[PDB]
């Protein structure tokens, strides 16, 4: 959960150089991102999630 006592840091991106294209080429493009965990990852203290709810029983 969100907590200042256990904040993790920040991730940022910047242009080192600019994007250069020749003529007869698109000047705009798209970029995609992915995230994953490594082999040194662990979790603790199972608990219920907030991403699913219910209001009535069938």
């Amino acid at each position: 959960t969100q907590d200042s006592f256990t904040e993790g840091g920040y991730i940022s991106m910047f242009y080192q150089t600019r994007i250069v294209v020749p003529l007869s080429t698109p000047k705009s493009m798209s970029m995609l991102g992915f995230v994953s965990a490594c082999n040194d990852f662990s979790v603790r203290l199972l608990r219920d999630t907030t991403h699913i709810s219910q209001s009535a029983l069938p």
């Binding site: 007869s24 080429t25 698109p26 705009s28 798209s30 995609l32």
Partner: protein, 264 residues
């Protein structure tokens, strides 16, 4: 250590390049779950056309433009009318097979775009009406043509003559899950700036060693544009996409008269 003795007699009570196949040749690949297709193990004589059915069949080409939202197919439904494979399907009660899927799309160095190809086991899609699980057999088995995705949910507000058709949504993958996690399934990415083709090898996956090929589809193939197509400063761009599928290690059993489903 702590002492424990099980009292009850029941366990439940206990506390817890060129690829050539047959007479076909196509000039890195991905193997789903790291399992190559194989025949049934040692644990009614099955019929097995070694080469009359294990070969590459090419489907109808589709067109990718600036407004395309995606395509989907179901296997073994898409190959129901391909040579002797379909005849064996409809002449037998039980069938089994793996697949090799090859997606082809070529462009130039001045084009840009990315396609995501996903192989999904037990790919169940959502309907287009308030009624639940009301989709019809004919609409759920398009065949070679396949279907398409949509950017929004269009409810079929017609009780007089309901269509009974799927209404997949691109960003929900047509099943109520976010598209970004679809990479959990076996997948490939075709980026026009690096490659032009994709290949996947699918073994037989099911809760049973063998099952009917007519009333149950084992695999689904979904192709979606992750990045829009573009070319120079042109308003309209269209390029072809082709799909070629090869059955592998196919077995059939339960020979009787032929089955003729009513497709419309």
């Amino acid at each position: 250590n702590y002492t424990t003795i099980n009292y009850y007699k029941d366990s439940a009570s206990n506390a817890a390049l060129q690829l050539t196949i047959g007479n076909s040749t196509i000039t890195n690949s991905v193997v789903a779950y790291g399992r190559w297709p194989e025949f049934i193990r040692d644990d009614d004589q099955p019929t097995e056309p070694d080469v009359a059915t294990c070969r590459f069949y090419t489907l109808d080409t589709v067109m990718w433009g600036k407004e395309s939202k995606g395509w989907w197919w179901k296997l073994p439904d898409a190959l129901r009318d391909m040579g002797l494979f379909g005849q064996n399907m409809y002449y037998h009660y039980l069938g089994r097979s793996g697949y090799t899927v090859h997606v082809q799309c070529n462009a130039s160095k001045f084009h840009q775009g990315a396609l995501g190809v996903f192989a999904i086991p037990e790919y169940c899609l959502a309907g287009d009406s308030d009624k639940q699980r009301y989709t019809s057999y004919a609409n759920a088995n398009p065949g070679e043509k396949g279907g398409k995705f949509y950017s929004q949910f269009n409810r079929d507000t017609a009780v007089t003559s309901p269509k009974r058709e799927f209404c997949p949504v691109d960003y929900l993958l047509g099943c109520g899950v976010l598209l970004g996690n679809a990479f959990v399934y076996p997948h490939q990415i075709i980026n026009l700036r690096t490659n032009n083709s994709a290949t996947i090898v699918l073994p037989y996956v099911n809760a049973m060693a063998i099952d009917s090929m007519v009333k149950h589809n084992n695999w689904g193939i979904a192709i979606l544009p992750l990045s829009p197509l573009d070319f120079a400063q042109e308003s309209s761009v269209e390029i072809p996409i082709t799909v070629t599928i090869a059955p592998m290690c196919s077995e059939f059993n339960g020979l009787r008269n032929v089955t003729a489903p009513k497709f419309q």
